[PDB]
Design a protein around this motif. Structure first.
Motif, PDB file in Angstrom:
ATOM      1  N   UNK A   1       0.862  -1.199   0.000  1.00  0.00           N
ATOM      2  CA  UNK A   1       0.000   0.000   0.000  1.00  0.00           C
ATOM      3  C   UNK A   1       0.874   1.216   0.000  1.00  0.00           C
ATOM      4  N   UNK A   2       0.262   2.338   0.295  1.00  0.00           N
ATOM      5  CA  UNK A   2       0.972   3.589   0.279  1.00  0.00           C
ATOM      6  C   UNK A   2       2.122   3.506   1.291  1.00  0.00           C
ATOM      7  N   UNK A   3       3.296   4.001   0.935  1.00  0.00           N
ATOM      8  CA  UNK A   3       4.381   4.046   1.892  1.00  0.00           C
ATOM      9  C   UNK A   3       4.035   4.838   3.120  1.00  0.00           C
ATOM     10  N   UNK A   4       4.467   4.360   4.303  1.00  0.00           N
ATOM     11  CA  UNK A   4       4.268   5.113   5.516  1.00  0.00           C
ATOM     12  C   UNK A   4       5.051   6.424   5.520  1.00  0.00           C
ATOM     13  N   UNK A   5       6.071   6.539   4.660  1.00  0.00           N
ATOM     14  CA  UNK A   5       6.828   7.786   4.528  1.00  0.00           C
ATOM     15  C   UNK A   5       6.000   8.960   3.992  1.00  0.00           C
ATOM     16  N   UNK A   6       4.811   8.718   3.445  1.00  0.00           N
ATOM     17  CA  UNK A   6       3.881   9.803   3.099  1.00  0.00           C
ATOM     18  C   UNK A   6       3.198  10.406   4.306  1.00  0.00           C
TER      19      UNK A   6
END
Ligand SMILES: CCCCCC/C=C\CCCCCCCCCC(=O)O
Length: 133
Positions: free
Chosen positions: A1-6
């Motif tokens: 899924x979307x990277x947690x870095x976002x």
């Protein structure tokens, strides 16, 4: 899924070609002058599989919540009622908005820890760079 870095809060530090992008969207002059002065924060969060992107500025606030791959109804900052979808491609968080036979894309990607939003309408390409704050 979307990277947690976002996840977190992002501040606009550079905007290139936003006036022409807004023109392509049909935004009028007085609104564009305020849009060109705005330096928003963008807050990206996630609860389960629901991602939220909240934009805050003196001029306008917006918020969208979505699941990847699932079309939703959106109200844009310039007050368009669009059918939108957000999906991933190579880790880029890619939004498409559709309305009245028109289309624009906003691709948000991480580049050396910055968030870069590439905004395309007709031939116009706008690039907005955010720092994590
Ligand atoms: C909401 C704050 C920025 C926009 C201020 C001007 C308002 C309306 C004009 C239409 C703008 C539509 C694009 C908003 C920016 C999308 C890309 C990004 O998140 O940087």
């Amino acid at each position: 899924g979307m990277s947690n870095k976002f996840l977190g809060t992002w501040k606009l530090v550079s905007s290139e070609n936003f006036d022409d992008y807004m023109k392509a969207l049909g935004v009028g002059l007085a609104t564009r002058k305020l849009g060109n002065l705005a330096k928003p924060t963008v807050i990206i969060s996630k609860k389960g599989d629901i991602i939220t992107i909240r934009t805050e500025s003196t001029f306008k606030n917006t918020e969208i919540s979505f699941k990847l791959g699932q079309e939703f109804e959106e109200t844009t900052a310039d007050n368009r009622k669009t059918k939108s979808i957000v999906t991933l491609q190579r880790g880029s968080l890619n939004q498409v908005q559709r309305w009245d036979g028109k289309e624009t894309t906003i691709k948000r990607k991480l580049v050396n820890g910055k968030m870069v939003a590439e905004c395309k309408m007709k031939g116009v390409v706008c690039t907005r760079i955010y720092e994590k704050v």
